[PDB]
Design a protein around this ligand. Structure first.
Ligand code: HEM
Ligand SMILES: CCCC[C@H]1CC[C@]2(CC[C@H](C)[C@@H](C/C=C(C)/C=C/[C@H](O)[C@@H](C)/C=C/C(=O)O)O2)O[C@H]1/C=C/C(C)=C/C(=O)O
Ligand SMILES: [Cl-]
Ligand SMILES: [Cl-]
Length: 394
């Protein structure tokens, strides 16, 4: 049968809470049903084991999403030529090339630049005097600087492509076309950058990708451009969301902030714990479609149906994490799926971990008395969650 399709997503947008419907879903035997704003209805997987099977078992596909009206919260399905929309062997081809610039070995040399950037930003916040906006004055410039210089997109255009990002991630039903319109404008902008790099190469990933295209014929011109778009958006928006949400969690329960003040060596383990607890997205991971008939948590997923994964819910599955709703900065074997799991495991994860570690490290060192100093504007009707503006003091 088909359980009553529930209104998805659930919410909320404020705080780090997960809708009670997620808890009721994990407790329910089998997979529940959901109806996203656009597209067909699909199953929702919320249990850790069930989530990891849909994410990492080759019997599920991301490529099959183009021959379906995929469940989604945004009207426009760009169908980008990115590795995330493909299966093997195409995914393997793209990921093998682009991953080289994002491994631990590759980004570790960036830690000093990030560290110094954070302290320089903190110098400016101190000089100006409280209050400061922890987003615009800290959380945003850090990841934006890194990705611009890694990718090769001018830092001075961040306002322009920031505005395009906001429209591309909006789920507001009003202006239901700004997304597709503004992504096309972003297509033209990125095309202009790629053209300039092909003309006059530089020491950035775009030039490296051009070379792999023009010389090695390892990817199409379309693949090259869509990866530039995704890397630029994820490169700066994701970390800009997590930094202020992480700090909010540590300040909300100030024992956590104090432990890190006393034991900075715990920062890596703490960052992992917060990646498990702090939700990035407002909904669920992109749909996976079953290539054959298979059983997922008691339910028989029908070959051809979409299964969504509630990563934040599976990260709070009490069957895998003791006291799932508590923050344990020293949680052992903390194999959360905050960065996904399997074939499409987050490629920027080494870079994201580094950025969060250094972002926190600098605040703890310089602003131990940090305190929220006003109303926190949270993101609403966007594909991601977190403080839009965060007034802070010290
Ligand atoms: C807090 C920061 C971040 C979080 C929480 C995060 C989370 C995730 C998750 C959960 C996935 C898999 C989604 C799914 O399977 O449905 C993913 C994939 C991906 N992420 Fe991230 N991400 C972050 C930052 C970044 C950054 C900075 C980059 C820079 C390039 C990036 C690039 C990618 C790419 C390319 C993929 C797809 C890889 C593939 O399909 O094989 N992410 N991320
Ligand atoms: C190479 C592409 C990797 C995409 C991942 C980014 C991280 C993550 C983690 C789980 C989150 C719930 C989703 C939320 C979606 C985000 C951040 C979308 C961003 C935007 O669409 C970027 C990727 C633009 C691409 C473009 O080509 O215009 O984001 O999951 C992935 C996004 C899934 C999406 C966009 C599902 C959907 O809404 O159908
Ligand atoms: Cl545990
Ligand atoms: Cl494991």
């Amino acid at each position: 049968t088909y359980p009553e399709s529930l209104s998805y997503p659930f919410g909320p947008d404020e705080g780090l809470a997960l809708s009670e419907s997620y808890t009721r879903a994990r407790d329910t035997d089998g997979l529940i049903r959901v109806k996203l704003p656009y597209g067909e209805p699909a199953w929702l997987a919320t249990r850790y084991e069930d989530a990891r099977l849909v994410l990492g078992d080759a019997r599920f596909s991301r490529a099959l999403s183009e021959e379906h009206d995929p469940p989604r919260a945004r009207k426009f399905n760009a169908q980008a030529k990115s590795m995330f929309n493909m299966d093997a062997p195409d995914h393997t081809r793209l990921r093998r090339l682009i991953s080289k610039a994002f491994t631990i070995r590759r980004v570790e040399e960036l830690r000093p630049k990030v560290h110094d950037l954070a302290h320089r930003l903190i110098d400016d916040m101190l000089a100006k005097g409280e209050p400061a906006d922890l987003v615009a004055d800290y959380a945003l410039p850090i990841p934006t600087t890194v990705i611009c210089e890694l990718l090769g997109v001018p830092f001075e255009d961040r306002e322009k492509f920031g505005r395009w990002t906001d429209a591309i991630l909006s789920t507001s039903t009003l202006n239901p076309e700004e997304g597709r319109v503004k992504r096309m404008e972003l297509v033209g902008y990125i095309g202009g950058i790629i053209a300039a790099r092909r003309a006059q190469p530089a020491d950035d990933l775009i030039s490296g990708m051009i070379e792999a295209r023009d010389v090695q014929d390892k990817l199409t011109e379309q693949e090259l451009l869509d990866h530039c778009i995704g890397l630029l958006i994820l490169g700066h928006e994701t970390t800009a969301s997590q930094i202020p949400s992480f700090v909010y969690a540590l300040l909300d329960q100030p024992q956590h902030w104090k432990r890190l003040l006393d034991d900075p060596e715990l920062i890596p383990s703490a960052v992992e714990e917060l990646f498990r607890f702090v939700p990035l997205g407002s909904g669920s991971a992109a749909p996976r479609y079953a290539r054959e008939d298979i059983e997922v948590g008691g339910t028989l997923v029908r070959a051809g149906e979409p299964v969504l994964v509630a990563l934040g819910a599976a990260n709070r599955d009490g069957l895998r994490f003791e006291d799932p709703e508590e923050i344990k900065l020293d949680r052992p074997s903390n194999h959360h799926i905050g960065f996904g799991h399997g074939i499409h495991h987050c490629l920027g994860a080494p870079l994201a971990r580094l950025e969060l570690q250094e972002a926190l490290r600098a605040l703890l060192e310089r602003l131990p008395t940090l305190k929220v100093a006003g109303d926190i504007a949270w993101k609403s009707e966007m594909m991601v969650r977190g403080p839009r503006s965060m007034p802070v003091g010290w």
